[PDB]
Symmetry: D5
Subunit: 156 residues, 10 copies
C-alpha cells in the first residue's frame, strides 16, 4: 500500500545523510542511478527528497550508500515536495533558474497560450534532463530540457 | 547613447497597452517578431518589459502595433527587469515553472556541479525557446529549452 | 488569434466596473450567465478576471451590462489569474475555504495518494459547483463540489 | 476533562512517528479508520494533528499502530490546528487546492452571497469527503465535497 | 438582488470621503446611527467598509452625510472585508487589540475548549459593543464585550 | 530580585511540558487556579508563557502539576511575551479573534476616539474574562469582556 | 465633536503637500511650531500625519503654510498612525533608530523590568525631544530623550 | 587576536544559560556590572549577545555566574547582532520602543535634517542609558537617553 | 533652510521624468555630471532620488534636462532614501550586488573585525565609484570601489 | 568526484565550531590562510560555509584548527550558499553593505549600462578584497574592491 509524508524535514534530513555517505564513498549521482533503469534526474530528485523510488530502485541505491532499512523504506514514501528553504533560493546556482522566470515568465505564459491555448504546461506529466554541450565560442553550455504535457482550460 | 529604466511600472504599463493593441488587431507574437531577424522569445520579452529592442526592430514592431514615438523609444530602453508581481506567481501557467524549481531545484544544483563543476549556468549568456511537439500517447507537449553558459567558481 | 494578459490589474479593474454596472441594473450572476450556455461558476469567474469568455458569450454579457467594445474584447483575453489580494484572504467568506486547507490539506494529500497514487488532483482538468441543501437541524448548507482529474507522477 | 495543545509541533512530530509505523505495517488510512465508527477524513486528520479522537477511537488506532500511552493521550488532545508549514503549500498535491482558491475564491464569495446571502459557509459545522470516481473519458477523478452550514451576517 | 464587492479599495475610498463629510458637518457616529434602528457598532462598521447597510439605512445616513446616489448604493453592497492595511496594525489604538491576542490568544483557546469543547467562538454569529465605565482609582475604562456563538467541532 | 526572559521558546517549551502533565493528571485550568487567589485567565496565561506567577502561586501550581524546581523558578520570570507562532494564527479558535479585528478594528478605533478621545485602551492596565452562557435561540455563547484603562494622547 | 481617520494615506498625502508649501516658503519646523504653545516634536509629528492639532494650532500653522480649510480640518482629525512605509525603514537616518532597537531592545526590556518591574514604559503617556549638543571630541551629537510613564503588569 | 561570530544563536543560547544562572543566584544586572568599570547598559547588552566584553570583564562576570571557560571566551567574541526574533517585537515592553518609531520616525528624520543637516545620527558612535524619575502626578517614569554623533552626508 | 521628504515616491516619480528627458535628449550620466564638480556616482544617485544636489549643481542639471522649477527645487531636498522596490532586487544587474552580500557578507564582517576591530565600515562617510577596464583574459571588467570610514564600537 | 550540499545548516554549524576552535587557539583569518596559496577572502568564505576548499587546503586548515576527518571532508563540499539568516542582515557591520545597495543600487545599474551595455557585472567571475587605508583627516578607511566580469545581454 502506498505511503506518504507530510513534513519535508524527515526526507530532507535523510538527504543530508545520503549526501554524507555519498561523499565518504566518493560516488557520483550518475553511478548511483546506474542499474536502476531510471533517469539520473529522477533518481537524484528522489535522494534529495523530491520523488519516490520504486522498491527495487530504493534497495539498489540503499545498498550502494549503505543505508539502513528505515531509510530504504523512507525513500519509497511519497514526499512532501518543496526543495527551496524559504521560497526564493539564496544559492547562486539555484537562483539563476528563478531569475529565468523573473525575466521570461510572462513570455512563457504568452507563448504557451499562443502555441497551445488557455491552460498550462504540466509540472506533473513532465520530464527534465540536463545535457552538457560544447560552446563553439569556447567553454561549455548546459541545455536543460523541460518537457511537459499541455492541459487545456475550457469552459464548462 | 544607451538609456536605462529604474521603475518597472513604466514598461509594464506600456506592455498592457501593447497587448490591447495586439488584441484589437488580432495579431500573434510570431507575426510581430516576423521580419525583425530576432527570435519570438526575445521580441516577446521586450514587448513585455523584460528586454530592450534595437532601434530597427522597435520601429518595425511599433509599425505593426501602431505605437506612438514615445512608446517606440521606451521599447529601446534597458528595462528594470522582473515580471512576477510579488515573487511567487499566482497565475497557474506561470506557477508550474516555479513548481519545477520547487521539485527539481536542488537536483539541477547537484547535476550542474557534477557535470560542469562549482559555479553556475548563466541566465545572461542564455537563450530559451518553446516548441510544440505531438505526444505519442495523445495530445501535445511543450519542450522548453534553457541554454546557458557554464561559468565556473574557482579559488583565487 | 488567442490573446493573453500579463498584469492582473487590467481585468480586476474591469471586474469592478462590471460589478458597479451589475449593481446599478440590479442583476444576478445567474441572469448574467443565462443564455450563454456556460455554467454560472465559469461565467462569474470570467467576469471577476479568472477565466476567458468565448466571443459570443462576451458579446452577450457585454450587452447585458452595457460594456464598451474594449471591455468586451478584454473579457475574451486569457487572464493573469490570481484573485487573492495578498496571498491569504482577509474576507471571512473567502478565508473559510483557506481554513479548510489549513485543517484538511495534509489529509487531502494523504487520501489522494492512498486512493489514486503519487501525483495530483488537477486544478486545470477541473470544475466546481455550489449547491444549496436544507439542513435537517434547521437552516441551510452549501455543498461545494471540487471535481478534478487525477494525473499521476511516475518515474522516468 | 478536555485537554488542548498550543504548539503544533508536538502533534506534528507524533504524526511523523505515526506515518513511519504505518509504513512499516503497510497499513492504509481506510483500514486504520475501519471499526472506529468515524469517517476516514476525520480519523486521518486526527492522525495528522488536525482533529482530536475520542478515547475509544484513540485506543483502537493506537493498537493498530503500536502507539505508547503518551501518544494515545496526545491524540485525544484538542490540537493547535494548521497543517501548512508556511502559509502557502510547496507540495504540488496540496498546492492545487490553494490554486483552486486563487482562481475561484472571489467567485465562491459572490455565489455564496447570491445563493445564501451575506455571511459565510462554515469551516466548523462542516464535513468533507474525498471520493474516487471513474472519468467517463478515461482515467480517474476525485470528487471532493465541502459541506458547510451557511451562517448569515445580519445587522443588529 | 444582493450585490457583493471583491476589491476593498472601493469601499475604503468611500469611507475616507464619508469621514471628510462627517468632519465638515461635525457629526458623531452616535448621531449618524440614531434613527436607523441599528446599533452604532454595526452602522459605523458599514460606513468604514466592513458591513452592508440595508437600503433604508443607507438612504438615511446618505442624507445626513450628503452622499450621492452611487455612494448610497455602494453602502448596500456586501463588502470584501478586512480593515487592516497589511495584517498587523500600525496604529497604536488598533494595535493594543492585536497585542491582547499576542498575550491572551492561547489562553482564550484553552479556556474556550475547557468551558465549551472543541470548536470555535464565532466571529459571524457575533456582536460587540464598547462602553465607557468610571475607574474607581480615577480616570475611565473601556469595557468591550465580545459576544459570539459557540460552534462545536465534532467527529463525523 | 526580579528576573526576566528574552527568548520565548524557553517558557513555551515549559508550557508544552505543563500541558502534558496536566493531561496525564486530567486536571482543568479552573482547578489549577483554585487556591492561588488569582483569576483563571491570569494563571492560565502564566502557564502558557505569557505572564509571571508570584512565588506562592508558582509553588502551588508546581505542586499540583509535579513540576521540578527550575520549572517553578521559570514560572516566576517575566516572560518574553507573544503567543502567536507567526503573526497571524493558523488555529481556527484563535483565528476568529484575529478576524474580529479585521472586521471591527477600525470601528473600535473610531468609537474609542468618540467616547474617550485621542489615545488608547490599554493592554497593560487591562483584564479579560470568559463566560459561557446559553443562547436564547438554542446552543451556547461566549461573552468575553475586555476591560482596559483609557490613556489619553495629549499635546505637549 | 472629535473626528478620526482610518487610512493613513489621506494624512500622508497632506504631509507631502505641507512639505512642498514649507519648502517654497523656506520655512523651518521650529518656525512653524513657534507661537503654537506646543513642542516642535509634537507639531512636526502632526504635520507628518502622526498627531492631531488642536483647532487654534491647526489654524495658526495653516496660516503659515497657506493651507485650505479642508487641510486645516484634516490636521485636527485623530490620525491612523504609522509612519514607516513597510515595517522596517529603508532610509538610513530612520534605520539607525531601528538598529538601536535591534542592538539594545532586549537590554531595554531587562533594565526596565529590573528598575521598575513587570509592565511597560508607555508610548502614550510619553514625550520625546531632540537636542543638538557639541561633541567634545569635535562635531555635534543628538541627544534624543524618550520620556514615558511606567505602567505595571500585575496579577488579577 | 579579535574573534567574531556569524550566527546569533550561539550567543543567544549563551544568554539563556546566563539568565538561568542569574535567576538561580537571584542576581541583578546592576550587581553583575559592578566592578567591571563599564556601564550597566553595555554589560547587560553583552550578556544578552549584543556587545563583546573585554577579557577582564568577561572573567569577572563569568565568575559571578559560574560560567565555564568556553562561555567566558564566547562573551569576548564580537557578536552577530540583532536581538529581535523576527523583525518586529512581539513583547509589549519591547514593542513600545518600536511604536515610538512608527509614530515619531519621520519627525526624527525631519528634525535631525533641520538641526544638523543631511546624514545620520549614528548607532555606533552611540550610547544609551535608562533612568527612573518620579512622575509629579504620581508613579514613576523612565527617561531613556539616546546619544549619538551626527555624521554628515556630503557631496563628493 | 534645509528641506526634507518623507515619501520616496515624489522623488522616484521625478527620477522617471528625468530619465524620459535624458533619453529624448540622448544624454549620458557622465555628460549630465560634467561641469558640476561632483562625481558621476553622486550626481546620478541624486537624479535617481537617493542624494540631494547642492543648489548650483541642481540648477545646471535642471538646465540640461529642461526641468520645471518644482523639479530643480525637489532635487535639492533631502530624500527618503531606499531605491529597491521591495527589499530584494528583481533586476539581474542589481541582484548580483545583493548576491555578493549573500556569498561574502559574513566574510566582510569577519575581515572588517580582524583588520579594523569591532564596529562598522560606514555607508555615510563613504564614496563609491565604478571603472570599466579590460580583462587580461579577454572582455571587460567592472572595478567597483567601496570606500568607507571605519567607525569603532567600544565599551562605555 | 565533486560533492555538493543542499542544506546550508550543515556547513553553517561547522562554521560555528571552526570559530570556537579558532578563538580557543587565538588565531587570525590571515594566519589560517597564510601558506594555503589562496586569498584570505576566499579561505575565510570557505570556513564560513560559502566556498569549497580544495583537498590540500582543507587538510591544511583542518590541522591548524584541529578539525576531525568529517569536518575536513565537509569543507571540500560545494556549499548551498547564502550567509544572510533571513534576507536582510540584522548585524550592523553586514547591514551597511545592504544599505549601500539601497542608496546606490539603481546608480550601479545605470552606470553599468552606460559604461558596458545591457547585461550584468558577474558575481561568479568575480573577486573582492578588503584593504585598510589611512584616512588623511584622521582614523582609518576600508577600501573594498568588487571586481566582476561584464557579461552582455544581447538579442538573439
Ligand atoms: O501541473 C498540472 O498538471 C495540473 O494542475 O493539472
Ligand atoms: O466558521 C465559522 O463557523 C464561524 O466563524 O462561525
Ligand atoms: O498599552 C499601554 O498601556 C501603553 O503604551 O501605554
Ligand atoms: O551608524 C553609522 O554610524 C554609519 O553608517 O556611519
Ligand atoms: O548569470 C550570470 O551569468 C552571472 O553572475 O555571471
Amino acid at each position: 500500500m502506498i505511503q506518504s509524508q507530510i513534513n519535508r524535514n524527515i526526507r530532507l534530513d535523510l538527504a543530508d545523510a545520503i549526501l554524507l555517505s555519498k561523499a565518504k564513498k566518493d560516488l557520483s549521482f550518475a553511478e548511483i542511478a546506474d542499474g536502476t533503469g531510471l533517469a539520473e534526474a529522477f533518481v537524484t530528485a528522489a535522494l534529495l527528497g523530491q520523488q519516490a523510488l520504486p522498491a527495487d530502485a530504493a534497495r539498489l541505491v540503499g545498498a550502494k550508500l549503505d543505508l539502513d532499512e528505515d531509510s530504504i523504506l523512507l525513500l519509497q514514501m511519497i514526499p512532501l515536495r518543496g526543495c527551496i528553504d524559504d521560497r526564493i533560493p539564496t544559492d547562486p546556482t539555484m537562483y539563476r533558474f528563478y531569475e529565468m522566470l523573473q525575466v521570461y515568465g510572462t513570455t512563457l505564459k504568452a507563448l504557451v497560450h499562443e502555441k497551445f491555448g488557455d491552460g498550462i504546461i504540466s509540472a506533473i506529466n513532465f520530464k527534465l534532463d540536463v545535457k552538457k554541450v560544447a560552446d563553439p565560442e569556447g567553454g561549455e553550455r548546459a541545455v536543460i530540457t523541460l518537457d511537459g504535457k499541455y492541459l487545456p482550460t475550457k469552459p464548462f
